Design a protein around this ligand. Structure first.
Ligand SMILES: COC[C@H]1O[C@@H](O[C@H]2[C@H](OC)[C@@H](OC)[C@@H](O[C@H]3[C@H](OC)[C@@H](OC)[C@H](O[C@H]4[C@H](OS(=O)(=O)O)[C@@H](OS(=O)(=O)O)[C@@H](O[C@H]5[C@H](OC)[C@@H](OC)[C@H](O[C@H]6[C@H](OC)[C@@H](OS(=O)(=O)O)[C@@H](OC)O[C@@H]6COS(=O)(=O)O)O[C@H]5C(=O)O)O[C@@H]4COS(=O)(=O)O)O[C@@H]3C(=O)O)O[C@@H]2COS(=O)(=O)[O-])[C@H](OC)[C@@H](OC)[C@@H]1O[C@H]1O[C@H](COC)[C@@H](O[C@@H]2O[C@H](COC)[C@@H](O[C@H]3O[C@H](COC)[C@@H](O[C@@H]4O[C@H](COC)[C@@H](O[C@H]5O[C@H](COC)[C@@H](O[C@@H]6O[C@H](COC)[C@@H](O[C@H]7O[C@H](COS(=O)(=O)[O-])[C@@H](O[C@@H]8O[C@H](COS(=O)(=O)[O-])[C@@H](O[C@H]9O[C@H](COS(=O)(=O)O)[C@@H](O[C@H]%10O[C@H](COS(=O)(=O)O)[C@@H](OS(=O)(=O)O)[C@H](OS(=O)(=O)O)[C@H]%10OS(=O)(=O)O)[C@H](OS(=O)(=O)O)[C@H]9OS(=O)(=O)O)[C@H](OS(=O)(=O)[O-])[C@H]8OS(=O)(=O)[O-])[C@H](OC)[C@H]7OC)[C@H](OC)[C@H]6OC)[C@H](OC)[C@H]5OC)[C@H](OC)[C@H]4OC)[C@H](OC)[C@H]3OC)[C@H](OC)[C@H]2OC)[C@H](OC)[C@H]1OC
Ligand SMILES: *[C@@H]1O[C@H](CO)[C@@H](O[C@@H]2O[C@H](CO)[C@@H](O[C@@H]3O[C@H](CO[C@H]4O[C@H](CO)[C@@H](O)[C@H](O)[C@@H]4O)[C@@H](O)[C@H](O[C@H]4O[C@H](CO)[C@@H](O)[C@H](O)[C@@H]4O)[C@@H]3O)[C@H](O)[C@H]2NC(C)=O)[C@H](O)[C@H]1NC(C)=O
Ligand SMILES: *[C@@H]1O[C@H](CO)[C@@H](O[C@@H]2O[C@H](CO)[C@@H](O[C@@H]3O[C@H](CO)[C@@H](O)[C@H](O)[C@@H]3O)[C@H](O)[C@H]2NC(C)=O)[C@H](O)[C@H]1NC(C)=O
Ligand SMILES: *[C@H]1O[C@H](CO[C@@H]2O[C@@H](C)[C@@H](O)[C@@H](O)[C@@H]2O)[C@@H](O[C@@H]2O[C@H](CO)[C@@H](O)[C@H](O)[C@H]2NC(C)=O)[C@H](O)[C@H]1NC(C)=O
Ligand SMILES: *[C@H]1O[C@H](CO)[C@@H](O)[C@H](O)[C@H]1NC(C)=O
Lengths: 412, 43, 259
């Protein structure tokens, strides 16, 4: 058997059909440098992408996505891309910065990055996903590309009958995503998004619910108002607890909190601006550089946390955003170049759409209820998220942004 | 007559023999404001 | 202590105040059972979830104190610790079952009208006094009420507080909480339809829950303030480590390590 999580680049040949060439922080412990430069590229992508997404939604809309899952998905098209289609992919996803070798086997190193993240979150936490590319059956796909796809992406491109059965193919895709995630993620693809001209569709969905390292007791949960950005109140279920947490009050009174999941390797980071400063302002003024700086400066202390329990199920087409960021030729029937995906003959292949959907569930649990005693451990500070705040889910050592979002409305 | 030791004074130290008798109370025939409140509760 | 009163001078001569050396801070309460041993709660020194692990050198005790901050010259006595012993099967991972610890002073402390050891129960004394309805006395310098905001130095008493509470039936204790209870604990406190109230709070852990013997008229420590959910919440009770039920381990540590 071939273990991609232990195997090395040479163990199995999987070079792309085309390659590309364009004209400090300490490296984490026990980490491959290429997986690391890859993780840093995704963070640069997440910044630009989140920005476009926010400036396309309503300040009062929640957001939740996995830039990591998106970058991985488009690294699979990159595998068979050439010319301007490939260049655009590289520049938009920030792959045009990393080194040659990392760039050429990017799909492989993404598997490597993912292997590491999958086994860390599932130790105790809940991290399931369902990713796949679907092509119209009338086409003849490159078998070598298939073998590489199944090895490095979990599954190979799935042929469907879009020309004669668009709705049924639509239903099969939603049913398949739902199956792979035990009913957690449904209706990834909205009706109308798939018709008889569909040829290739990208689908990447991800779910999570980590077991809190220190959970909230339900008996301390109660309704309380939550002040949304528009100006309206809102009855939300506010959880509460006291414990030791990494905290920090930064510039302009913005508060940063880190709530770790069991294991400590994966944590949630909350950014809460002062009642005066809008979330939108922090969304624009924040970069990976400043975030890493805040995360570096956090101090551990006893404090109280008031946090609403919430649910965010955000799904959407990636097409418009990405084109707006410069990924154009990939979605164009006339200009697209993805020779590596199809067998030899002559291809007019291009991506019809790309869909993402991520689901985050947060409650008291995240088995015996724990208690801590009556010793004197005063709350130094108190973090009350009764207004819009940002959310990040990351892998500590590598600082990999796994999920990112905004809780603009938790109530009903 | 009333209290029988349990630990060996060698490793326990002094004071067990006279444990429980407050210098400013029992030993001075005095009671505190609410110890009566305790005896009442004793069925 | 919630809903208590300023204890009288010398009312609790075995009360011990437990401090972390540096930075200095009041951690818990504790009791004097001899001139060299002090008993307290285990979670006051060891609690891995908060990276809390205090050892002999990080600790210090002040004995015979009344006021919480004013230095009481010629009355109170400070003592360092030679060694501390945590019950090996203390369950910090869930319910604080067997929440008990022993501490040996560097040098024996001298008794006075203000410093005096309390008695540990024997099977008989523990069988006749440990009955539901019967009241015991809890004491300490813990907070005066539950809080939900930043609270460093808030709600603290200027002098030792005291309150008397009635032992509750094991059936009622178990149904007041979803935290797996054990025979090594027992709960005290007034039921909702009793009107009166009171309880131990943050800072009282390790303190003694004592009872006066109607037999020999001596005070006995039956419990150790251990845990609760909030402080003095309606329909909830305070939990205490059952001292007698752990006397076997106490003896095991003493005539093995006080040598
Ligand atoms: C290593 O690995 C690591 C990692 O890794 C990773 O990976 C990564 C890495 O990392 C490293 C990194 O690095 C850095 C990276 O790598 C990488 C590298 O680097 C970076 C690189 O380099 C750079 C590489 O590279 C390569 C490549 O590849 S790639 O991929 O990259 O590609 C290759 O490739 S190929 O393909 O080719 O091949 C190559 O490459 C190269 C080449 O060639 C050369 C070349 O060619 C030429 C190339 O070149 C190139 C260039 O470049 C150069 C380029 O350039 S550019 O610019 O472009 O770039 C170009 O140029 C032009 O090109 C060229 C060419 O190319 S081609 O392709 O074409 O060809 O290239 C080059 C390069 O460079 O690249 O080559 C290279 C190089 O190579 S080299 O080689 O040379 O280098 O790569 C690499 C890789 O990749 O790899 O990175 C990586 C990755 O990353 S990522 O991120 O990516 O992923 C990995 O991953 C992968 C990972 O993963 C996988 C890893 O990691 C992993 O893994 C690892 C490893 O593994 C192996 C690991 O690690 C590990 O780890 C581990 C862990 O850690 C953590 C470790 O381990 C260690 O350590 C650890 C830690 O330490 C610290 C440890 O652990 C530990 O352990 C310990 C131990 O354990 C064992 C522990 O400990 C703890 O614990 C323990 C335990 O456990 C379990 C403990 O111990 C213990 O102890 C105990 C105690 O003691 C004290 C014991 O026990 C015993 O004894 C005891 C005592 O005794 S005496 O005698 O003394 O006494 C005992 O006890 C006792 O008992 C008794 C009895 O009992 S019983 O029960 O039994 O019977 C008692 O007694 C008492 O009791 C009682 C009570 O009971 S109960 O139970 O019931 O309670 C009693 O009784 C009574 O009571 C009862 C009851 O009652 S009621 O009512 O209450 O219920 C009763 O019963 S019944 O039934 O009835 O009920 C009874 O009755 S009867 O009838 O029955 O009789 C009663 O009786 S009575 O008479 O009384 O009536 C009692 O009484 S009381 O009252 O008093 O109580 C008692 O008495 S009596 O007699 O009476 O009976 C006791 O008690 S007391 O009181 O007395 O005392 C007891 O005692 S005590 O005191 O105890 O308590 C017991 O039992 C008997 C016995 O038995 C058991 C035991 O035994 C002895 C012991 O055991 C031991 C201890 O102590 C304590 C503790 O502490 C210490 C610990 O803890 C925890 C732990 O810690 C943790 C361990 O172990 C040790 C160790 O081991 C050794 C390890 O080791 C160290 C490690 O290893 C390492 C890790 O981790 C894991 C993982 O994960 C992470
Ligand atoms: C079906 O899908 C598979 C999977 O991707 C594709 O396979 C890849 O195809 C590309 C070319 O189309 C391969 O890339 C080529 O590899 C050659 C490697 O040979 C040796 O290279 C050096 C020799 O110095 C050795 O280190 C190495 O071990 C090999 O012995 C290169 O020589 C080729 O050079 C290319 O140069 C320029 C790029 O700068 C190109 O424009 C040229 O056309 C020329 O190809 C090139 O790098 C790749 O290795 C294949 N990988 C796999 C897994 O087989 C299929 O192409 C695709 N086919 C269809 C029908 O779509
Ligand atoms: C995702 O797909 C899997 C299978 O592709 C679904 O699991 C299947 O669940 C059905 C019942 O819902 C099981 O039916 C039983 O099959 C056995 C044959 O092995 C038969 O003898 C019984 O009479 C019964 O019909 C089926 O075994 C099981 N498949 C297996 C073996 O894993 C799953 O329900 C799907 N998830 C969703 C809801 O999308
Ligand atoms: C909790 O922490 C204390 C302190 O541990 C520190 O690191 C240890 C490796 C040791 O070098 C200590 O001196 C340091 O203060 C633990 O106390 C020591 O624990 C080790 C192993 O558990 C033991 O061998 C030593 O004898 C202890 N102290 C001494 C004299 O060194 C304590 O055990 C820890 N307990 C828990 C629950 O984590
Ligand atoms: C892609 O198109 C360019 C444009 O002329 C061409 O030069 C290049 O060789 C093509 N790449 C391949 C081999 O598919």
């Amino acid at each position: 058997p071939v273990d991609i999580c232990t195997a090395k680049p040479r163990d199995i040949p999987m070079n792309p059909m085309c390659i590309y060439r364009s004209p400090e922080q300490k490296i984490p412990e026990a980490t491959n440098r290429r997986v690391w430069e890859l993780s840093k590229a995704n963070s640069r992508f997440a910044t630009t992408f989140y920005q476009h997404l926010a400036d396309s939604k309503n300040d009062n809309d929640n957001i939740f996505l996995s830039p990591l899952s998106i970058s991985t998905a488009f690294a699979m098209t990159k595998l068979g891309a050439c010319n301007d289609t490939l260049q655009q992919l590289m520049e938009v996803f920030k792959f045009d910065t990393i080194s040659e070798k990392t760039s050429d086997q990017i799909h492989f190193f993404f598997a490597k990055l993912n292997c590491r993240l999958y086994r860390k979150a599932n130790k105790a936490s809940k991290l399931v996903s369902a990713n796949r590319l679907f092509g119209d059956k009338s086409l003849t796909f490159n078998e070598t590309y298939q073998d590489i796809s199944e090895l490095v992406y979990g599954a190979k491109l799935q042929p469907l009958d879009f020309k004669e059965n668009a709705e049924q193919s639509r239903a099969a895709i939603n049913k398949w995503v739902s199956n792979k995630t035990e009913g957690r993620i449904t209706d990834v693809i909205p009706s109308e998004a798939i018709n008889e001209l569909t040829v290739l569709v990208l689908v990447n969905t991800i779910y999570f619910k980590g077991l809190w390292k220190s959970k909230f007791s339900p008996e301390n949960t109660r309704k309380e108002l939550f002040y949304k950005a528009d100006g309206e109140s809102c009855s939300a279920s506010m959880m509460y607890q006291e414990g030791k947490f990494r905290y920090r009050r930064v510039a302009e009174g913005t508060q940063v909190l880190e709530l770790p999941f069991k294991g400590d390797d994966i944590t949630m980071v909350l950014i809460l601006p002062k009642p005066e400063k809008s979330l939108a302002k922090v969304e624009k003024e924040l970069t990976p550089e400043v975030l890493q700086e805040w995360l570096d400066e956090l101090e551990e202390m006893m404090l109280c946390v008031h946090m609403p329990r919430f649910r965010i199920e955000d799904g959407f087409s990636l097409k418009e955003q990405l084109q707006d960021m410069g990924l154009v030729d990939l979605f164009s029937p006339e200009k697209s170049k993805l020779p590596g995906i199809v067998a030899e003959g002559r291809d007019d292949l291009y991506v019809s759409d790309a869909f993402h959907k991520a689901f985050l569930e947060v409650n008291e649990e995240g088995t015996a209820v724990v208690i801590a005693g009556r010793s004197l451990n005063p709350n130094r500070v108190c973090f009350k998220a009764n207004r819009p705040f940002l959310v990040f889910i990351r892998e500590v050592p590598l600082n990999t942004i796994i999920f990112m979002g905004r809780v603009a409305n938790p109530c009903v | 007559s009333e209290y029988q030791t349990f630990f060996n004074p060698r490793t326990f130290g002094s004071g067990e023999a006279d444990c429980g008798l407050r210098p400013l109370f029992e030993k001075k025939s005095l009671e505190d404001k609410t110890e009566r409140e305790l005896l009442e509760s004793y069925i | 202590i919630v809903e208590g009163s300023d204890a009288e001078i010398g009312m609790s001569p075995w009360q011990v105040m437990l401090f972390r050396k540096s930075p200095q801070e009041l951690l818990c309460g504790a009791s004097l059972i001899s001139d060299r041993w002090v008993l307290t709660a285990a979670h006051c020194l060891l609690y891995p979830p908060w990276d809390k692990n205090f050892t002999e050198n990080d600790l210090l005790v002040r004995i015979g104190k009344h006021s919480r901050t004013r230095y009481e010259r010629n009355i109170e006595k400070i003592s360092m610790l030679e060694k501390i012993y945590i019950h090996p099967r203390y369950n910090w991972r869930e319910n604080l079952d067997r929440d008990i610890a022993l501490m040996k002073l560097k040098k024996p402390v001298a008794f006075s009208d203000y410093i005096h050891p309390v008695c540990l129960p024997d099977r008989e004394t523990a069988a006749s006094l440990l009955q539901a309805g019967y009241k015991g006395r809890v004491t300490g310098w813990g907070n005066l009420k539950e809080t939900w905001t930043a609270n460093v130095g808030k709600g603290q008493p200027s002098v030792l507080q005291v309150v008397n509470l009635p032992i509750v039936e094991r059936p009622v204790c178990k149904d007041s909480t979803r935290i797996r209870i054990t025979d090594n604990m027992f709960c005290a406190g007034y039921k909702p339809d009793e009107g009166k109230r009171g309880d131990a709070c943050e800072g009282d852990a390790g303190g003694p829950f004592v009872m006066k013997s109607p037999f020999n008229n001596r005070w006995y420590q039956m419990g150790i303030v251990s845990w609760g959910e909030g402080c003095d919440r309606d329909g909830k009770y305070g939990f205490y480590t059952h001292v007698f039920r752990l006397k076997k381990w106490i003896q095991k540590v003493i005539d093995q390590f006080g040598e």
